[PDB]
Amino acid sequence: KMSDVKCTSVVLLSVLQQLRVESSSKLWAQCVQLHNDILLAKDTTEAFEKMVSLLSVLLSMQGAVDINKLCE
Amino acid sequence: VGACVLCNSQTSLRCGACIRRPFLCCKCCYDHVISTSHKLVLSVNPYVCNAPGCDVTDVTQLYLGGMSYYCKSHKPPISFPLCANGQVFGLYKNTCVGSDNVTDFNAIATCDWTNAGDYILANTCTERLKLFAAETLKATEETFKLSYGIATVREVLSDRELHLSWEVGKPRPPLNRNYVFTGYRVTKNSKVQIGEYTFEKGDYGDAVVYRGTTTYKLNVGDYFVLTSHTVMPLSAPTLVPQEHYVRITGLYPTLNISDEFSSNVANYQKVGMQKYSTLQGPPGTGKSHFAIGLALYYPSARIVYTACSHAAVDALCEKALKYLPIDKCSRIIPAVECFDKFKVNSTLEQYVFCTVNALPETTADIVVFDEISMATNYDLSVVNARLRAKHYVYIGDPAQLPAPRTLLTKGTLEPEYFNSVCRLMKTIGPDMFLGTCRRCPAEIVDTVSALVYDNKLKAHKDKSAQCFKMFYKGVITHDVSSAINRPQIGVVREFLTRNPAWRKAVFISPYNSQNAVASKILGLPTQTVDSSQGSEYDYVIFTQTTETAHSCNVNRFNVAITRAKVGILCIMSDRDLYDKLQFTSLEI
Amino acid sequence: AVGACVLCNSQTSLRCGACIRRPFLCCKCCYDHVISTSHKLVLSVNPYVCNAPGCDVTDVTQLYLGGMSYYCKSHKPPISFPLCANGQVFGLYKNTCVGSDNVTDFNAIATCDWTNAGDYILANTCTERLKLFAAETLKATEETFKLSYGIATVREVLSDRELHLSWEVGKPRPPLNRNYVFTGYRVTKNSKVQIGEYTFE
Amino acid sequence: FSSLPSYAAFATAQEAYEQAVANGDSEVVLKKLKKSLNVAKSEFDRDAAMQRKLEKMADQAMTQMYKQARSEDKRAKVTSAMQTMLFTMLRKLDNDALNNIINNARDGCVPLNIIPLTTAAKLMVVIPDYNTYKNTCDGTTFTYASALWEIQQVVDADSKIVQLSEISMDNSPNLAWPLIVTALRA
Amino acid sequence: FSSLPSYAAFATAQEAYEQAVANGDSEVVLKKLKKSLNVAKSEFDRDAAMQRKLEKMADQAMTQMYKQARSEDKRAKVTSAMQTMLFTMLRKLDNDALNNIINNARDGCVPLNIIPLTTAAKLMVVIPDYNTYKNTCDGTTFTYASALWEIQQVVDADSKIVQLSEISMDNSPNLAWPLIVTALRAN
Amino acid sequence: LTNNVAFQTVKPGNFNKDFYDFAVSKGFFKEGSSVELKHFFFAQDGNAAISDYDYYRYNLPTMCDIRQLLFVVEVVDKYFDCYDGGCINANQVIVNNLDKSAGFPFNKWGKARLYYDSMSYEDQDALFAYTKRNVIPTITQMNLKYAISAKNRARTVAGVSICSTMTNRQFHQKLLKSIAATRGATVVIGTSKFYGGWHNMLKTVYSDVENPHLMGWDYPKCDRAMPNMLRIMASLVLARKHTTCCSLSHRFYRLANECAQVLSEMVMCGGSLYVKPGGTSSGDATTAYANSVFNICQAVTANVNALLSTDGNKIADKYVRNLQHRLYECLYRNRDVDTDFVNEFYAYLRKHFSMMILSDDAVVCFNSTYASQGLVASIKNFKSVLYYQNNVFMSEAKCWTETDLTKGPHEFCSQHTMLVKQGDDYVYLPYPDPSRILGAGCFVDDIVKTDGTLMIERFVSLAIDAYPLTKHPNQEYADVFHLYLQYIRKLHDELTGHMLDMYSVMLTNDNTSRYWEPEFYEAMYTPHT
RNA sequence: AAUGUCUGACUGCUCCCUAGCAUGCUACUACCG
RNA sequence: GCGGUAGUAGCAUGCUAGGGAGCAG
Ligand SMILES: [Zn+2]
Ligand SMILES: [Zn+2]
Ligand SMILES: [Zn+2]
Ligand SMILES: [Zn+2]
Ligand SMILES: [Zn+2]
Ligand SMILES: [Zn+2]
Ligand SMILES: [Zn+2]
């Protein structure tokens, strides 16, 4: 289960980086920090809260129109 | 491998002699090959007899003997005819539909696009054949007008190094990827092709590099006929599904409106009352005013503005700069100069300023398409592709100048035929109208309204007593690609010596070298009618040098005469437009 | 090293090295240059010589194209063809090389010695490329002639204006002229430095 | 390699050789049907060989062009394949907080920074119109990311501080629709 | 390979063969005919293949020498590039100050790490955080390497200009943080 | 150099979802299990390059005990007398992959192919002859690696300009290739581990000791903490093979060039030039070999300290005192070499301390009772030596130890050893770490390696590496290999399906069925070809 | 209007594909002794 | 009836070269 968290965090960081977020500086530092922390975590709960904190970044922007893919 | 462009039934076949090489189900391909000149079909392998030299490219003369393809005089005792049973030997033969009116595409394929009736045909079929006619019309343009290409090789050097030579005087086309030629080696006998071939120049001529489809030996007695080649396939709709809304769907109008755009608040609401809107804004009636008032009326919305030329996009940019905050506007530039005071290229923006070729791929609340006059169905396709907005605004005026159809030579495209949004503006008509001409004098406004506006364009400023006309044919002299009327220019010189306050006037002519010789004699600023579209001047001097359908074009005359703010002089070679023009006449 | 023939201007990388300036000859033109005059040395971007060790035969007419190199008649490989055949020397652009027959004045300038008036007469009344070639050849020849001269040691420096200069032993002394400008050389012992240029009278 | 005229030739050779060995013929006749059948094999092996060579050549050409087409078409579409993969993974995870904020965002509520984790560190949210405000902000509390938040300031689109009790269904048109809430962690 | 003298001999041999075998005469006829076919295919066993070896060797030599021409061409090209780069780099240094500090060197041979430490004009300072900015780049000028430097432009990681005001103790955690300070040698 | 410093970042890896779904479908990755995911593609932010170049501050000036160094250098040299070296002309060098980067400033105009292809043999030999009499300092560029790992520190590798390699090659290649082609030596570079190689290597290192134990250690910060003196010593030991080709001044100038080029030269990190204080630059022309030399040096130094720091009266054997007594003699009392002592001491070491050395990675089979008494070196001596001669503290959690001599090494070259009965005898085999193989399967660099259809070959290679797991007494371990095989089968099937779909052809012949059957793989580890 | 280019070290081993050459092995045919 | 050389095809081994990849320090 925890492996699933690590895996989706990898994919999320890939999406962020390809959305040009690394152009800005401090934001990319924070994203990299959270990703590398998730990859080394041991218990599921705090990994989940880092995961939500990191997803908040992608949600804060309007490049991905989630109302499309959330069609199931 | 694809879907029958008429039937959507899955096809593995392409039409060889056809310019776009499209997908046609066995039945549709059958219909095309029996109803047109197209006898070549393209699948995984080209359809031809594989006996040495047997150049049988007629689809109806091939028979599957053994594993290879064969003619009659070559088929071994075990075979059968491909072109039979109303269908062709093509994959998914059972799941074939066969379009009923293949005559549509059968005529779109075997035409020349120089007749207006072919444009009517394109405008008057389903959307699929509409985009097909779009691709094939751009293909006809590029294969004819847009650059060219035959070259005969001098000698081989290596596997990818080759001496070439075009025909002395023949159009030598640029060497790019979007330029490939059909490689023909003729033995004596055997007009056989060796594939498709792009070329590029290296660091020394004429031993150039070439990329070839086939891997055949390239002989010294070869030559590469230029092909019907380079476009970009279109897979994007044109006029989205019109959905009138009873509410301002998804827009939050402001609580305070300004007087400038108070003249259009019902107009903006009615834009919000529909999926897309089309407004008829005559020149100097406040089209840009309406356009910025759109966003100023709904302050919490994400809007994208687009137009054909860089100039109109820049005009909307400066209008916004006056009315829209710089931080929220954005100029998009392609990799020529234009606006840059806005943040250059920012997709995540409230106001996006980009030309139709340089649109990005994202969403929006509204896309306001300016310059609908120069718009074609390709442009609508690409704007619907690159942007997905809940609302669209097609601002402009079809009575203005369109995009030039250079390959067109015989006929006149009615403003109904410039596009399909302009078509709806000449059928269902513009949903709205800018009924206040704040640029032209009363004479010019009543003129353009009685001409190409149906007496409906209202004259803001009154009779300026400075819009003049002169019926003078002059002597029509032609140089390489224009027409120059030196006696006409002469009476204009006499006017300047008589009217030194009219030395500031803008010389206008339906051509370029008449303008040039005028400037060489008058010295005044000489611009053309198309370049003046989007530019307004105080005093104007229009000399209709010729009486051709170009010079006497009511759209061209309309927009050229609307270029005046205060006064205008018109040395008229035609009498019709002279009498329809309600100006203060002059003696020669 | 690929260029246009100095006579027919078809692309080529052929030169006859025995001619002092080595101009670009086409295959036909180079063949005519090598069969008629004394330039029995031809070179493309690679030299044409019997690549056998100990065999230093020079002319191309006695060479044979071997496996990868060109070898003489003797050390020839069994499977090999010559480099002089059908009036074209083996080089680049064999089929588009056109050549001509203006090899006459070409041999005339490539074999002259500029010691007579008639040579300069012909050099003034030949074709454009031939004229530039003649100018080039005569400038190179006069450069080599001036370098055939030698040194001149100072006997006494009377002043900055008057000089006692004796010239080389067993050497034709250069006349008192303005054109022949003399650069000076003073060795420390160790490091001969150029002490400037000087004119005589 | 059957569909060959050389196959018919070689097969006739085999049949005639069998007739020669089965009829009890003389010594030199079988030499005619051995030298001809062996020249027949020296031609049939050869033609079958060359045809299987050309066949396998076309086959490897096919596999190569297939590889090329596949690779390029996939490289074209990474920017969307990644997004769909990400969201199917997120849906398969099934956590309460993730789904909470994804549904809030598909409605219209998005943050304006990184959601912090300590009890300090503010947090800002955009509210689109007031219904979701009913489903969320109830009094001084705020439920976001399945955690409790204390509202500390509201404001509408025109940067106007808006009192708490000021908002209601009746007075709803008296506010700019995109409200903004600044809460802290419980 | 069809216009070949050995192939013409092969052709006339086959012709005499088919002729004198169609008029069937004696066994000596067939014997001489088979021998002539043998000598004819002996001609066309070499004149059909050895010339293909001539062709392959000519082609490989030609390709190799084309590639050698390419080698020398790119050679000249990189040569030109190197020398133009050297010249343009040199045309930026020859302040007479350099000549001066070389003259004052007893032998002309000076170390390198001090040349930009004396004769250079522009300075670039990279600062990790605020506290380090306090100790060293303060005000509009500061002194380093025994000279005065007048500050002239500041930028952050994204290289977006930052006026000297924003470097507040409290505004600091709002910018990237390796800030690049450019300065100029005062005089 | 230019007006703005560049900030380099490191992107994250790519996910192969199909393989992950497969592996969880077959029951892998269970909670609490042993095999798992530990190897990822760690991402780095802006100031990553400089924050790793800064790690040189662990390099400090170090003064060496000159006499004991002058002795151990002789013994190390004696470890190196079976090869042959000397200069070679330009037309005998062997360059594999002429298509790599050419360092700074040359990389602005093409790869190494250009410069190795635009300079005739005369120019290359002239360049050699020139550096035999001059000094050419060069610039070194620092590049960031991008590869899987299990610790989230960035990693960098130095790219030396072409002017250095083009000549170091002609100076060293003969001896290098002579080392890489010898069997049964101490340095085991070039000895393939397949087709029984692992067994032969283990048997050789074992080699007739009396009461064997195993042991292996680890240097912390090996390439950044090595002091200059031992690097210079290693270069001298390598150049020792040049007594006839070069003359004396030539050898000094070659030493000076190698120092000024790979020991303390300018480094072009970021976009500016810094000064490298010391230590090796891992990317030069001779890294693995010089590291081997330095390794043997430290081992010999530890043995010497062990033997000299022990009380004499406690020694039982007369011959061993004689050895210790005369060793103190030859170290401090004497002044010049004494060949017989060096010989017999080297033989003593070869009997009581056999070694197997790849670059900085050693395995030792040593007497155990001697070690207990203090006649050879144990771990503690290595710790002390590293402390005072390398400026690092080797923690004992990284130095394994083995007693039964039948379960190999614990770990060497990041492989574990297992003793399996194959055919009819008992052979040694190497097997990797399963989490490593699974990680390699799931996470790839580019997005075309994430479509198994095109790339079955790398799965074949991975399975070849994973084979020896099948013989493990555990159970998830063998399931790794079997999972890989079934994956290959699945890929081939879907590929034929796709091909029949898009076009209609079916392949004529495959000969791929030998890839999902387990004798093609086991062929590699038993002995022939 | 261009076009075009972007950081990838030194080694060692291994698998796969292709090409070339020679060599080696075997068969078919031909000539002569 | 044998030998030999020449050819051609098939097959193998090896060496070089070119390309794709994997692991290790
Ligand atoms: Zn159809
Ligand atoms: Zn067609
Ligand atoms: Zn046919
Ligand atoms: Zn000559
Ligand atoms: Zn010529
Ligand atoms: Zn010779
Ligand atoms: Zn040497």
Q: Specify the 3-state DSSP secondary structure of A25.
A: coil
Within its chain, how far is the Cα of B8 from the centroid?
A: 27
Q: Would you say the C-beta of D46 is within 7 Å of strand H?
A: yes
Residue B369, burial from CB neighbour count under 10 angstroms (0-12, 13-18, 19+): buried
Tokens representing F499 are 């091909």
Q: Specify the 3-state DSSP secondary structure of C120.
A: helix
Helical pair B127-143 and B116-123, crossing angle rounded to 10 deg: 150
Instruction: List the end-to-end C-alpha distance of chain C, in Å, as a whole number.
Output: 45
> Rounded to an integer, what distance in angstroms lies between the CA atom of residue D181 and that of residue C119?
102
Please indicate whether residue F338 is annotated as part of the active site.
no
Q: A touches which chains (3+ CB pairs under 8 A)?
A: B, D, E, F
C-alpha separations of F356 from B187, F79, F200, F298, F428 in Å: 71, 12, 12, 14, 16
Within its chain, how far is the Cα of A7 from the centroid?
A: 11
The residue written with tokens 């700019």 in the block is D176
Ligand 6 centre distance from Cα of residue C75 (Å): 5
> Rounded to an integer, what distance in angstroms lies between the CA atom of residue C65 and that of residue C50?
9
Q: Note the CA–C1' distance, C191 to G17, in angstroms.
A: 63
> Rounded to an integer, what distance in angstroms lies between the CA atom of residue E43 and that of residue B173?
50
Tokens representing A5 are 């968290």
Q: Specify the 3-state DSSP secondary structure of B527.
A: strand
Q: Specify the 3-state DSSP secondary structure of B277.
A: strand
Render the burial of F35-56: b for 16+ CB within 10 Å, e for the rest. bbbebbbbbbbbbbbbebbebb
> Rounded to an integer, what distance in angstroms lies between the CA atom of residue E160 and that of residue B266?
44
Residue E119, burial from CB neighbour count under 10 angstroms (0-12, 13-18, 19+): middle
C-alpha separations of B211 from B201, B208, F404 in Å: 12, 10, 66
Tokens representing F275 are 């000064």
- Look at chain A and report how many structural domains it folds into: 1
Please give the backbone phi and psi of residue C177, each rounded to the nearest 5 degrees, phi first.
-140, 165
Q: Which of F188, F146, F195, F172 is nearest to F48 (CA)?
A: F146
**Taking the CB of residue D67, how many other CB atoms lie within 10 A of it?**
14
Q: Note the CA–C1' distance, F142 to G10, in angstroms.
A: 14
> Rounded to an integer, what distance in angstroms lies between the CA atom of residue F276 and that of residue F264?
5
- B459 phi-psi bin (left φ>0, alpha ψ -120 to 50, beta other): beta
Provide CB contacts within 8 A for B201, sequence distance 6+. Answer: B175, B208, B209
Tokens representing F442 are 């799931």
Q: DSSP state, B583?
A: S
Q: Which of B288, B301, B291 is nearest to B254 (CA)?
A: B301
Q: Which of F1, F151, F20, F6 is nearest to F450 (CA)?
A: F20
Please give the backbone phi and psi of residue E51, each rounded to the nearest 5 degrees, phi first.
-70, -30
Give the closest nucleotide to F292 (alpha carbon vs C1'). Answer: H25
Fold of B442-585: Rossmann fold (3.40.50)
Measured in residues, chain F has a length of: 529
**Taking the CB of residue F480, how many other CB atoms lie within 10 A of it?**
23
Residue at minimum CA to C1' distance from nucleotide G27:
D42
Provide CB contacts within 8 A for B160, sequence distance 6+. Answer: B209, B210, B211
The single residue of F52, F360, F465, F479 carrying the catalytic annotation is F360
Within its chain, how far is the Cα of D94 from the centroid?
A: 21
> Rounded to an integer, what distance in angstroms lies between the CA atom of residue F478 and that of residue F466?
9
Q: Which of B349, B353, B350, B358 is nearest to B341 (CA)?
A: B353
Ligand 1 centre distance from Cα of residue C201 (Å): 101
The verdict on A6 touching F (C-beta cutoff 8 Å) is yes
> Rounded to an integer, what distance in angstroms lies between the CA atom of residue F331 and that of residue F315?
20
Please indicate whether residue F465 is annotated as part of the active site.
no
> Rounded to an integer, what distance in angstroms lies between the CA atom of residue F432 and that of residue F477?
10
Within its chain, how far is the Cα of F498 from the centroid?
A: 43
Strand C192-198 and strand D147-155: pairing?
unpaired
Strand B484-485 and strand B476-477: pairing?
antiparallel
Q: For chain D, state the CA radius of gyration.
A: 42
Instruction: List the end-to-end C-alpha distance of chain B, in Å, as a whole number.
Output: 70
Looking at beta carbons, which residues of chain B come within 8 Å of E77? 203
- D72 phi-psi bin (left φ>0, alpha ψ -120 to 50, beta other): alpha
Q: HSE of C142 in the Cβ direction (CA atoms, 13 Å)?
A: 9
Tokens representing F158 are 């130095």
What single-letter amino acid sits at D154? V
Handedness of CA F79, F81, F87, F88 (dihedral sign): negative
What single-letter amino acid sits at B239? L
Tokens representing F241 are 């093979």
> Rounded to an integer, what distance in angstroms lies between the CA atom of residue F334 and that of residue F466?
55
- Which residues are B223's β-sheet partners? B152, B184
Distance, in angstroms, between D114 CA and closest chain F CA?
Answer: 18
Looking at beta carbons, which residues of chain B come within 8 Å of F498? none
Please give, one letter per residue, the 3-state secondary structure of B25-82: CHHHHHHHHHHCCCCCEECCCECCCCCCCCCCCCHHHCECCCCCCECCCCCCCCCCEC
Cβ-nearest to D62 among F453, F454, F505: F505
Identify the domain containing residue A48 by its residue range.
Answer: 1-72
Tokens representing B402 are 């369109």
The helix (H) or strand (E) run that includes residue B355 is strand B351-355
> Rounded to an integer, what distance in angstroms lies between the CA atom of residue F515 and that of residue B343?
58
- The distance between the two most distant Cα atoms of chain B, rounded to a whole number of Å, is 94
Q: HSE of B452 in the Cβ direction (CA atoms, 13 Å)?
A: 25
Looking at beta carbons, which residues of chain D come within 8 Å of B300? 157, 176-178
Q: Which of F154, F145, F163 is nearest to F103 (CA)?
A: F163
> Rounded to an integer, what distance in angstroms lies between the CA atom of residue B372 and that of residue B422?
7
**Taking the CB of residue F130, how many other CB atoms lie within 10 A of it?**
11
- Which residues are B14's β-sheet partners? B23, B42
Which of A20, A26, A30, A32 has the highest number of chain E CBs within 10 A, making it the mutation to test binding with E? A26
Tokens representing F249 are 């001044």
> Rounded to an integer, what distance in angstroms lies between the CA atom of residue B360 and that of residue B557?
36
Q: Note the CA–C1' distance, B556 to G2, in angstroms.
A: 34
Provide CB contacts within 8 A for B333, sequence distance 6+. Answer: B339, B340, B344, B345, B358
- B189 phi-psi bin (left φ>0, alpha ψ -120 to 50, beta other): left
Q: Specify the 3-state DSSP secondary structure of B402.
A: coil
Q: F touches which chains (3+ CB pairs under 8 A)?
A: A, B, D, E
Q: Which of B516, B479, B271, B499 is nearest to B395 (CA)?
A: B271
> Rounded to an integer, what distance in angstroms lies between the CA atom of residue A49 and that of residue D145?
9
The single residue of F361, F378, F465, F479 carrying the catalytic annotation is F361
> Rounded to an integer, what distance in angstroms lies between the CA atom of residue E119 and that of residue F402?
63
Contact call for residues E150 and E141 (beta carbons, < 8 A) = yes
Starting at the earlier edge strand, list the strands of the sheet with D141-144.
D123-127, D179-185, D147-155, D141-144
Distance, in angstroms, between A28 CA and closest chain E CA?
Answer: 11
The secondary structure of B189-237 as a DSSP string is: S-EEEEEEEEEE--SSSSEEEEEESS-----TTEEEEEPS---------
Q: Which of B399, B431, B450, B456 is nearest to B283 (CA)?
A: B399
Tokens representing F268 are 């072009």
Contact call for residues B440 and B581 (beta carbons, < 8 A) = no
Resolution to 1 decimal place, in Å: 3.3
> Rounded to an integer, what distance in angstroms lies between the CA atom of residue F394 and that of residue F362?
15
Tokens representing E86 are 């050297």
Contact call for residues B511 and B483 (beta carbons, < 8 A) = yes
C-alpha separations of F4 from B512, E137, E142, F7, F270 in Å: 49, 18, 21, 10, 10
> Rounded to an integer, what distance in angstroms lies between the CA atom of residue B117 and that of residue B120?
5
Indicate yes or no: CB of B203 within 8 angstroms of CB of E66: no
Within its chain, how far is the Cα of A69 from the centroid?
A: 17
Please give the backbone phi and psi of residue D30, each rounded to the nearest 5 degrees, phi first.
-65, -20
Strand C81-82 and strand C84-85: pairing?
unpaired
Q: Would you say the C-beta of F414 is within 7 Å of strand H?
A: yes
Render the burial of B315-341: b for 16+ CB within 10 Å, e for the rest. bbbebbbebbeeebbbbbbeeeebbee
C-alpha separations of E146 from E93, E94, E185 in Å: 21, 22, 11
Strand F425-431 and strand F416-422: pairing?
antiparallel
Provide CB contacts within 8 A for F350, sequence distance 6+. Answer: none
> Rounded to an integer, what distance in angstroms lies between the CA atom of residue D49 and that of residue D57?
12
Distance, in angstroms, between E139 CA and closest chain F CA?
Answer: 22
- What technique determined this structure? cryo-EM
- Which residues are C156's β-sheet partners? C164
Instruction: List the end-to-end C-alpha distance of chain E, in Å, as a whole number.
Output: 85
Tokens representing E106 are 């007893």
Strand F212-215 and strand F401-402: pairing?
antiparallel
The helix (H) or strand (E) run that includes residue E123 is strand E122-127
Contact call for residues E37 and E12 (beta carbons, < 8 A) = no
Tokens representing B312 are 């109109």
Q: For B396-438, where are the alpha helices, taking DSSP H only? A: 421-426
Q: Which of B465, B466, B447, B468 is nearest to B456 (CA)?
A: B447
> Rounded to an integer, what distance in angstroms lies between the CA atom of residue B477 and that of residue B502?
25
Provide CB contacts within 8 A for F135, sequence distance 6+. Answer: F253, F256, F257, F260
Q: Which of F345, F238, F346 is nearest to F292 (CA)?
A: F238
Looking at beta carbons, which residues of chain B come within 8 Å of F502? 1
Please indicate whether residue F361 is annotated as part of the active site.
yes
C-alpha separations of D109 from D173, F63, F357 in Å: 19, 67, 63
The secondary structure of E57-120 as a DSSP string is: HHHHHHHHHHHHHHHHHHHHHHHHHHHHHHHHHHTTT--HHHHHHHHTSTTS---STTHHHHT-
Q: Would you say the C-beta of F151 is within 7 Å of strand H?
A: no
Give the closest nucleotide to F168 (alpha carbon vs C1'). Answer: G10
Q: HSE of B238 in the Cβ direction (CA atoms, 13 Å)?
A: 23
Q: DSSP state, B342?
A: S
Strand F140-144 and strand F156-160: pairing?
antiparallel
Beta strands in F345-465 (DSSP E): 353-358, 361-367, 401-402, 416-422, 425-431, 443-444
> Rounded to an integer, what distance in angstroms lies between the CA atom of residue F384 and that of residue A46?
42
> Rounded to an integer, what distance in angstroms lies between the CA atom of residue B556 and that of residue B562?
10
